[PDB]
Amino acid sequence: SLWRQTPDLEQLNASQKNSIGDLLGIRFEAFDDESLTASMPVDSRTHQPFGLLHGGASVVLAESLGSMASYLCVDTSQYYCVGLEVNANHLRGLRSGRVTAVARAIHLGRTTHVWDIRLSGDDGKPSCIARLTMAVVPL
Amino acid sequence: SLWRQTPDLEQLNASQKNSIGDLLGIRFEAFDDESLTASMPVDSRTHQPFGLLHGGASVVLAESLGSMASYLCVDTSQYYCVGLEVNANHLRGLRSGRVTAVARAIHLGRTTHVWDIRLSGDDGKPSCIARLTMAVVPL
């Protein structure tokens, strides 16, 4: 419904080869008519030096997810999307397991998109909330 | 001047072992009485799928830098610091070389710190600006 290109999880995952998403183990996991979901491990790849998930790593997941969501909503023969502004509140710390992010659209304008991204650890409690603004740019 | 603990670059770098900073090649490079500086490579470790520096990777650098700056400003026998809020504007894209971030203090309160972090690529042009709010928490 939201999407122009039907999300293809194998393709989304494969496209991360030789980029930070592959390095951190980001996995696109699910989608429906209103949302796209990806998760990331909480381990030495994504920890800060004190053994907690790095707040920046939460932002990598959020921006990977939202950037991919934008790509799936534009005419990619004419436009590309790049991150313009990002913000996040770090709500709860995580030490292990996986962190899961779900992106939903706030506004898909002609020149900007705004995404709402909610993250939680395996206990299901909110761990981070992010908002991402993407610029839509002529190819 | 700003610092409680004198910054020790070897220690800052060594402390990143088995965390995302080591994985992405973040290197603490310089400091003075008012600032702390670190850089990060722009390559396959930090690219997004289109060959540009991942906006989230800029945020990892900014939050690594600011979190370390906070650690150097508090009494670590009584307090620790964790990221509370982060935001960034993505100004210019980068494809290669290194990205360098400089952190300066905006406010060091008793319960929160606010850091200004400016990033630029090797051409010296501003590429990202971030602002980070850390919570100061009793050990």
Side-chain angles (χ1 to χ4, degrees):
Chain A
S1 261
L2 181 63
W3 314 114
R4 183 180 196 266
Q5 286 72 234
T6 301
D8 181 323
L9 301 178
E10 200 75 22
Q11 278 180 57
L12 272 34
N13 290 318
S15 67
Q16 295 191 121
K17 193 186 182 172
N18 303 325
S19 68
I20 186 170
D22 197 34
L23 199 65
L24 301 183
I26 292 172
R27 172 176 78 206
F28 288 84
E29 305 195 318
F31 73 90
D32 56 27
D33 281 5
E34 293 183 301
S35 69
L36 180 62
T37 297
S39 71
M40 181 176 66
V42 183
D43 58 30
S44 65
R45 290 168 285 180
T46 55
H47 281 163
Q48 33 86 305
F50 305 100
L52 294 181
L53 175 64
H54 195 297
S58 287
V59 177
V60 176
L61 177 55
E63 183 150 340
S64 271
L65 186 50
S67 294
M68 190 59 34
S70 272
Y71 185 69
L72 295 169
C73 286
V74 306
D75 175 6
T76 53
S77 64
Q78 299 228 266
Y79 299 108
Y80 67 104
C81 300
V82 288
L84 179 63
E85 211 277 339
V86 69
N87 56 256
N89 271 264
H90 300 307
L91 308 175
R92 290 183 170 85
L94 298 172
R95 282 199 185 275
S96 58
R98 295 186 72 79
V99 55
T100 302
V102 178
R104 288 173 183 282
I106 294 303
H107 181 238
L108 298 183
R110 290 197 292 172
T111 57
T112 61
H113 292 170
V114 181
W115 295 95
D116 167 67
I117 304 104
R118 309 292 184 97
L119 291 72
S120 63
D122 290 330
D123 62 11
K125 300 174 163 183
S127 63
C128 182
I129 176 169
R131 196 170 70 254
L132 175 63
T133 305
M134 303 288 298
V136 184
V137 192
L139 218 33
Chain B
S1 261
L2 181 63
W3 314 114
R4 183 180 196 266
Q5 286 72 234
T6 301
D8 181 323
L9 301 178
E10 200 75 22
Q11 278 180 57
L12 272 34
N13 290 318
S15 67
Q16 295 191 121
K17 193 186 182 172
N18 303 325
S19 68
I20 186 170
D22 197 34
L23 199 65
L24 301 183
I26 292 172
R27 172 176 78 206
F28 288 84
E29 305 195 318
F31 73 90
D32 56 27
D33 281 5
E34 293 183 301
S35 69
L36 180 62
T37 297
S39 71
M40 181 176 66
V42 183
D43 58 30
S44 65
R45 290 168 285 180
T46 55
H47 281 163
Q48 33 86 305
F50 305 100
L52 294 181
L53 175 64
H54 195 297
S58 287
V59 177
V60 176
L61 177 55
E63 183 150 340
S64 271
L65 186 50
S67 294
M68 190 59 34
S70 272
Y71 185 69
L72 295 169
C73 286
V74 306
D75 175 6
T76 53
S77 64
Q78 299 228 266
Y79 299 108
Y80 67 104
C81 300
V82 288
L84 179 63
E85 211 277 339
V86 69
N87 56 256
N89 271 264
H90 300 307
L91 308 175
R92 290 183 170 85
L94 298 172
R95 282 199 185 275
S96 58
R98 295 186 72 79
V99 55
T100 302
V102 178
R104 288 173 183 282
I106 294 303
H107 181 238
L108 298 183
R110 290 197 292 172
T111 57
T112 61
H113 292 170
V114 181
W115 295 95
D116 167 67
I117 304 104
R118 309 292 184 97
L119 291 72
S120 63
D122 290 330
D123 62 11
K125 300 174 163 183
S127 63
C128 182
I129 176 169
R131 196 170 70 254
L132 175 63
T133 305
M134 303 288 298
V136 184
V137 192
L139 218 33

